[PDB]
């Protein structure tokens, strides 16, 4: 049918490297690649008190940005499927394979 790949990471350079690796794996296999479409970034935020006792007015605001990429292959030759299903990507990147 068709395979879409959802990539998640906290660093955007890492997710871009992973997406580049994926599109090279696919195009060098001879499949067609739709993407990579940059999906909106989900940035969680946290506000914590930096004092051990009181001092509520003293706080630090932290955040975690989750970067999203979507890669679609329209006709996934068996070559493409079993090529990408054994790709080696960075540790901080989460990859989903939907069929």
């Amino acid at each position: 049918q068709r395979i879409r790949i959802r990539l998640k990471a906290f660093d955007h350079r890492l997710i871009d490297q992973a997406t580049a690796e994926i599109v090279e794996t696919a195009k060098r296999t001879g499949a067609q690649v739709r993407g990579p479409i940059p999906l909106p970034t989900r940035k969680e935020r946290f506000t914590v008190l930096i004092s051990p006792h009181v001092n509520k007015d003293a706080r630090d605001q932290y955040e975690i940005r989750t970067h999203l990429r979507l890669v679609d292959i329209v006709e996934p030759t068996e070559k493409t499927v079993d090529a990408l299903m054994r790709l080696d990507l960075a540790a901080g990147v989460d990859v989903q394979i939907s069929l």
């Binding site: 906290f10 935020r45 946290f46 914590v48 605001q61 932290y62 975690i64 940005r65």
Partner: protein, 100 residues
């Protein structure tokens, strides 16, 4: 927190996994269903014979490192102080100071 407080939390988690996972879910199901035995389902009396610590509502989220019962964050499982300590040392992935 004291050692006894952490031991209490551990025991409560264990009891909640043992009983309320299946038995108390069944009993509360019998209690909430309107179609079943509107007179003597007997489930209400059996729900109180179970240990109290088996109720998940009696668990208190404490920092996984210190046991602090206040300022907890479910995302990290730590209190605000230990969250900040780990964040500044670069031990929480992706977390950094925010500005906008």
């Amino acid at each position: 927190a004291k050692q006894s407080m952490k031991a209490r939390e551990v025991k409560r988690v264990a009891l909640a996994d043992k009983y309320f996972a299946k038995r108390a879910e069944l009993k509360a199901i019998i209690s909430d269903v309107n179609a079943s035995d509107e007179d003597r389902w007997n489930a209400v009396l059996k729900l109180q014979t179970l240990p109290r610590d088996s109720s998940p509502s009696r668990q208190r989220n404490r920092c996984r490192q210190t046991g602090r019962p206040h300022g907890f964050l479910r995302k990290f499982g730590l209190s605000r102080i230990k969250v900040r300590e780990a964040a500044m040392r670069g031990e929480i992935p992706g977390l950094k100071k925010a500005s906008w």
